[PDB]
Design a binder for this molecule. Sequence first.
Ligand code: COA
Ligand code: COA
Ligand SMILES: OC[C@H]1O[C@H](O[C@H]2[C@H](O)[C@@H](O)[C@@H](O)O[C@@H]2CO)[C@H](O)[C@@H](O)[C@@H]1O
Ligand SMILES: OC[C@H]1O[C@H](O[C@H]2[C@H](O)[C@@H](O)[C@@H](O)O[C@@H]2CO)[C@H](O)[C@@H](O)[C@@H]1O
Ligand code: MG
Ligand code: MG
Lengths: 596, 595
Amino acid sequence: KIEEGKLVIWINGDKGYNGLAEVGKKFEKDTGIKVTVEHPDKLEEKFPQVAATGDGPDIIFWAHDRFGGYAQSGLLAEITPDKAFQDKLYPFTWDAVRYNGKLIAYPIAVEALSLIYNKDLLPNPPKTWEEIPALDKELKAKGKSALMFNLQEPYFTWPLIAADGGYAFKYAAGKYDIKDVGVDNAGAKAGLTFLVDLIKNKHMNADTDYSIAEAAFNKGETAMTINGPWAWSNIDTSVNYGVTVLPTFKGQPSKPFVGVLSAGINAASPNKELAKEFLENYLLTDEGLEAVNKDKPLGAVALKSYEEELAKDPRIAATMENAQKGEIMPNIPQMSAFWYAVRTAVINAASGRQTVDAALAAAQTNAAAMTVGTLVASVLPATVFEDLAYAELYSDPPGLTPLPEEAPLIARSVAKRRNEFITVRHCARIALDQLGVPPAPILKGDKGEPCWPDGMVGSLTHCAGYRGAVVGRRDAVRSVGIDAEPHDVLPNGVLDAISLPAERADMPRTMPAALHWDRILFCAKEATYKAWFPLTKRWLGFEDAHITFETDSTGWTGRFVSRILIDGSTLSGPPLTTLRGRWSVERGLVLTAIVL
Amino acid sequence: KIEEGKLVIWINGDKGYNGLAEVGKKFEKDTGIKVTVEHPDKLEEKFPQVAATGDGPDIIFWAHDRFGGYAQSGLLAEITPDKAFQDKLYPFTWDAVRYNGKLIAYPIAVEALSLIYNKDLLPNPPKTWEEIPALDKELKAKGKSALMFNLQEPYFTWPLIAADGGYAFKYGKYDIKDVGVDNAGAKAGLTFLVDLIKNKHMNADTDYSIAEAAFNKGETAMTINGPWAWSNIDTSKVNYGVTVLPTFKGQPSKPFVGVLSAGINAASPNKELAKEFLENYLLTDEGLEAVNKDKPLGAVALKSYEEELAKDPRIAATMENAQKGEIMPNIPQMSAFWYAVRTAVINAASGRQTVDAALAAAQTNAAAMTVGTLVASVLPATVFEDLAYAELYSDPPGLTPLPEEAPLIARSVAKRRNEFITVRHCARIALDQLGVPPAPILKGDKGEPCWPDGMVGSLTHCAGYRGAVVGRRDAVRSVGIDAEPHDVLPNGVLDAISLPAERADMPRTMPAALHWDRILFCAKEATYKAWFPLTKRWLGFEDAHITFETDSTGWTGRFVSRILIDGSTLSGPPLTTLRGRWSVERGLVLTAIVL
Ligand SMILES: CC(C)(COP(=O)(O)OP(=O)(O)OC[C@H]1O[C@@H](n2cnc3c(N)ncnc32)[C@H](O)[C@@H]1OP(=O)(O)O)[C@@H](O)C(=O)NCCC(=O)NCCS
Ligand SMILES: CC(C)(COP(=O)(O)OP(=O)(O)OC[C@H]1O[C@@H](n2cnc3c(N)ncnc32)[C@H](O)[C@@H]1OP(=O)(O)O)[C@@H](O)C(=O)NCCC(=O)NCCS
Ligand SMILES: OC[C@H]1O[C@H](O[C@H]2[C@H](O)[C@@H](O)[C@@H](O)O[C@@H]2CO)[C@H](O)[C@@H](O)[C@@H]1O
Ligand SMILES: OC[C@H]1O[C@H](O[C@H]2[C@H](O)[C@@H](O)[C@@H](O)O[C@@H]2CO)[C@H](O)[C@@H](O)[C@@H]1O
Ligand SMILES: [Mg+2]
Ligand SMILES: [Mg+2]
């Protein structure tokens, strides 16, 4: 339910969202249409999760790299600006938002990282990465540090990894080869090894994140940081700073990945024409962009008339100099896998979990395993999106490995078991990363129940043609149970063992004739057990729950309620007398989920 | 089936087993009774394992410290020497073999560790442990080392741990609640030892054969060993002396002193032949000499022969060290003490735990005595070299999971946490007996436990019991064990778990005292556990027809589980019939299947 006659906009919390809300107010005053701007955490991961249910914002702002994934899952409207409107924006910006022959967002601004330094602590910034250990030694003696920047997001480390030859996907003939991944070559290993040595030699701390680095720079405790244009506003309020070219590595320029902040329209919006009017006639004007830019700088904007003014800011000149040395990101759907793979490699190598060589070998494998599918998202409650995450795969990608801690669980297991175990736990680690949790082994405990990291709950499922994981923050979600089954009739004799007479009477009457209601019931019973057992530590048989279904008007998705016939007491907390879930049949599979 | 009219004797492979076999040949020549001497590995653990089934050797040789644990489980005959025979041995040696007022073994000889040195490399051995790092540095400059000894067995490191105040159980009786392995003296000793290793004066991997080889090849100037070691050194080119162990912080090293002793298996049908062999053949001047010439015994218990041995300066040094140490207790808690200290010395030496963490865990582990033999009574004695076990009837306080295991029970209820932790402590005790270092035991397919490479096993836990049995995979395909309380089954369960023919035939095969319904259930569960690792498929209660026999003794017997479904395995032959054993004791049913 996206509300008709209003706009909801998502944009990242480090950007000028208050400025954008001012453009929103102007729009309301002219047209009567209320504009609500929100900035949820991890919105780049939450958007598909909610847009899959037909929910979410009318308009989503993010760097262009994520948009191909959204388009592949059918989540974006096609954009068709007219001739005069296209001519108002730089051509390379339209190319950024073009995917498979269609425009999938409006380009807004060009972002690239620069080196930002405190001129009073450091009147001459370092030209090379290699001189930074020496500089940190000198600064540490004065009670300061040379450099702090966000080590938790690979965006900030990539310029160094790419400098001496790291790359994401090989480009040729206007086309990216997803089988030629450049994260494990000599150049990438050299850059990452330099970073890990900085940490080992106590020149940086592996836990430094965005807020830590920003606070340290803006209070004058560190001489340098690496950040984008959005960051300048907070500094300006604190420091006499310069924005300059990133240091070289092995004498080669650092090569940041360049983003074009872009605005896409939800394919489920009933407000597409209003969204287009807003973007074309209110935002992408000098006045609109100025409103946002004065809140937090956008970078070099896509609109030529205003970029001609901003280009005179020497901070923007520095921005474009670093952008020229770097590369525009791909927008292919495999980008989200690339990023997960590099995030994880960097974090594991920085913390000691893996050697650089192991961390990057694994990234090269993982960057293959794209997870932009949304089948299970369709059975999750959008209202709790901030505390849930998911990932799914429809095959077993080659070369995935279990974590060393997990390996004993499948050491004497059959091949199909080894594959489903490894693949589903990869999904689990992708989902956990969405909630901000680093890589952890997922072991098996009481009656085979999966063992989650502190503060997390979840569920796993694997059948023919599917592996999926859903994870939740335990401070908001008591338990999760999910289950996938092939959408086939049940084998002989199974329906009677798994069902009650009333279910057999009611369901064929309630469900569309096209659906294998027998298998759907069985899938829901299994999800019920998975949600149940972590909280009760007791058996629940198929005959111990009576499940009733309802069907949405689409005919392919709905709700169910499982009423428990035995003692529903839990070890702590409210009893599980009933459990509510959702079901969906799509792509040959049945998905069910319960979030308690 | 211990054979009547023959004697089988077990003694450790570091002792004079050939000499003992010579006394055996003389017996056979006089009496017509054949004597077979064997030296199984880990025989101190293997004896109770096989004797629990009424099998094993007629006579068991070991230091007296193990014998209380054997007596407690009813494994030894009381011995009946007359007063004239007792006056032939030293009184304090009889004291070592008296348990709850009864004599439970014949004493043979007094053993203590001494410092053994190469007179050509080191004509003035060091009086103190503190000089050894400097000596080593000097010798290393000549391609040599100062000292090597077995760091794998806590017997050898104990003298240093106890030097400055470590003790086992505080002594008219031993207080098992006052354990001294974690006081300041013990930590000082063990810290010294770990420091030797950190400073590259010794290596954590050094074991008995490694140290022996090095000393007898003249590569190291000193070792620490008992009298049994002397004959191998005689045969080598090394010119050696035997002397007082070095002091530590000015206090003498205090070895734990063993009395080698010979017990009689309570299940032996040859008790009078054993008595004759021991009293009239072995415990004579000539018998002890035969053994002593093979590998020296130490200061023997027989006064007439000790009169001769006491003139040897090596024996004088043995006794000097023995008097500075202490005779070991014979209380059944000794084997837990040794397991605790073993684990601690190995963990600290290797750096897996700090000295303080290691010794604090040892103080805890010294409480968890495992001398029970209920699951041992259902294990096949023919496979004893490749099986080990341990069981507990309670949850000892303060046991913890391995860190790798902790997530498996992080949100589990108290009773689950306890049973999980205690059973895995049992599993680690069993793995130790097979020479496998401590490992986590995780849970895999359908909850199956996850064993170290090359091992198989099974776990069980019910009210009043935790037990583990582990086997070497190259000899044992699968193990399934199961414990249940010996109670009638809940209403309706018998019909759910049994087949009609079982309900018809089983009551006729079992004595009136038994809950046959429960024993059937327990065997079915054991069958699944042996089955699943090999097949990875379900086996239902109606999918095996189990038949039973009972031994004449009435509380143990055999069963056969016949698989009624397809028996295909992941490898090897299909499962067809699985033979097991069952036992009922102390209100519990135990079952085991070893494939
Ligand atoms: C456990 C069970 C529900 C699994 O469902 P399934 O559809 O066969 O298999 P899926 O692949 O969807 O689920 C397998 C995953 O479930 C999870 N699971 C297993 N036991 C579990 C438990 N006790 N609690 C929670 N989750 C559990 C595991 O993560 C497992 O994957 P892993 O072994 O790779 O970790 C099913 O095998 C079963 O045993 N059902 C009996 C109980 C039941 O369904 N009762 C109905 C109540 S109305
Ligand atoms: C699994 C089962 C056999 C365990 O037996 P139990 O007597 O109830 O419980 P016990 O305490 O003796 O045994 C529990 C241990 O068995 C072991 N175990 C559990 N699942 C197992 C499997 N699939 N394969 C092998 N061993 C398994 C585990 O080590 C477990 O302890 P842990 O969880 O601490 O690691 C029983 O719970 C069960 O599910 N039985 C159904 C199948 C069956 O018995 N079929 C009859 C065949 S004729
Ligand atoms: O760290 C990987 C991350 O990098 C990029 O995200 C940038 C974003 O482009 C900027 O607008 C700014 O917000 O910081 C982000 C890094 O934290 C990619 O756009 C994104 O897909 C990727 O996950
Ligand atoms: O290492 C612990 C071990 O010490 C003693 O074992 C001795 C034994 O007494 C000697 O006769 C000789 O064989 O060396 C053994 C050490 O390897 C205890 O008697 C024994 O119970 C204990 O486990
Ligand atoms: Mg399923
Ligand atoms: Mg049981």
